[PDB]
C-alpha cells in the first residue's frame, strides 16, 4: 500500500519532498479505492497523471490553492491539474482566441479577466475584435505557458477528486477524495496557502476543519462573464501576470 504509493508518486514525477504531507493524504483512502487506482484503470486522468499538480511544485512553494471539482467528463481534457483543460494547445488565434479556448467557456472567461487585469484589454470592450488587434509577442501562446505561470506564482491546482469515471459517480468519488484534500490542508497549516475559492467551492471548504486556518478568498466562478470585470479578481490575479511569456 505505501510501496504502492511511492511508486505512483514517481509515476508522476513527484518530488520526495512531498512524501510527509501527500502519503498521509492519500492514506486516507479506502483501499478497495487504493487497490482499485493501482490497477490504473477505469479511470481520468491517466494513473500517471494523477499527481500532476505536485509534479512541479514543492510543498515549500506553494502560496495558493486553487480548486476545482473533478477532472471532468473529457478524457482529452483531463491532465491531472484542476483548472486548465487539456484540449487547448494555441491561447490565440487570428480572429482572437482560439476554437478550444472559446468553447471552454470558464478558461475563456478567465483569460479575458487576465487581460483586463494587466490592462491589455478595456474592461467594456472584450470582444474577439479586441482580443485579435492586441500585440502578442510579449504574451503566452500556450496552454501549457498558462499552466507554467500558475505554478511559477505558487498555484497548486488542486482538484477535491482527483479521478473522474463517470457523471454519475462523482459525488461518491468526492466523498472517497475528502479526507485526502483534508489531510493535505493539514499539512500546509505551518505554510499557509491561500485557498482561492471559486463559487460554491467556498461554502463546502468551510466543512474541513482545516480550511479554517488556512487564508481563503472567495470568487464567483469564470464561467460568469461577471468574473471578467471583477475587480477581487484583477486584484488577485494580476499580480501573477499569467498571460505574460517568461
Known amino acids: 500500500p505505501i510501496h504502492q504509493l511511492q511508486e505512483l508518486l514517481r509515476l508522476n514525477g513527484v518530488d520526495e519532498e512531498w512524501e510527509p504531507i501527500l502519503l498521509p493524504a492519500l492514506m486516507t483512502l479506502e483501499d478497495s479505492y487504493l487497490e482499485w487506482m493501482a490497477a490504473g484503470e477505469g479511470y481520468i486522468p491517466p494513473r500517471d497523471r494523477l499527481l500532476a499538480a505536485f509534479s512541479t511544485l514543492r510543498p515549500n512553494e506553494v502560496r495558493y490553492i486553487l480548486f476545482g471539482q ?139 476543519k482545516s480550511a479554517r486556518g488556512l487564508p481563503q478568498v472567495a470568487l464567483e466562478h469564470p464561467y460568469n462573464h461577471t468574473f471578467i470585470v471583477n475587480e477581487k479578481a484583477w486584484e488577485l490575479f494580476g499580480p501573477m501576470d499569467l498571460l505574460l511569456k517568461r
Open 70 to 208: 473533478d477532472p471532468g467528463p473529457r478524457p482529452e481534457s483531463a491532465i491531472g491539474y484542476a483548472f486548465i483543460d487539456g484540449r487547448v494547445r494555441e491561447i490565440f488565434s487570428p480572429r482572437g482566441l482560439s476554437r478550444e479556448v472559446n468553447r471552454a467557456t470558464s478558461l475563456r472567461n478567465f483569460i479575458k479577466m487576465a487581460l483586463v487585469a494587466r490592462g491589455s484589454l478595456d474592461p467594456r470592450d472584450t470582444s474577439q475584435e479586441a482580443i485579435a488587434a492586441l500585440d502578442k509577442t510579449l504574451l503566452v501562446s500556450q496552454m501549457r505557458e498558462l499552466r507554467e505561470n500558475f505554478e511559477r506564482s505558487g498555484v497548486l491546482l488542486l482538484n477535491m477528486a482527483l479521478l473522474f469515471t463517470s457523471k454519475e459517480e462523482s459525488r461518491r468519488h468526492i466523498r472517497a477524495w475528502r479526507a485526502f484534500i483534508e489531510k493535505l490542508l493539514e499539512g500546509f497549516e505551518a505554510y499557509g496557502p491561500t485557498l482561492i475559492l471559486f463559487g460554491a467551492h467556498a461554502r463546502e471548504v468551510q466543512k474541513l
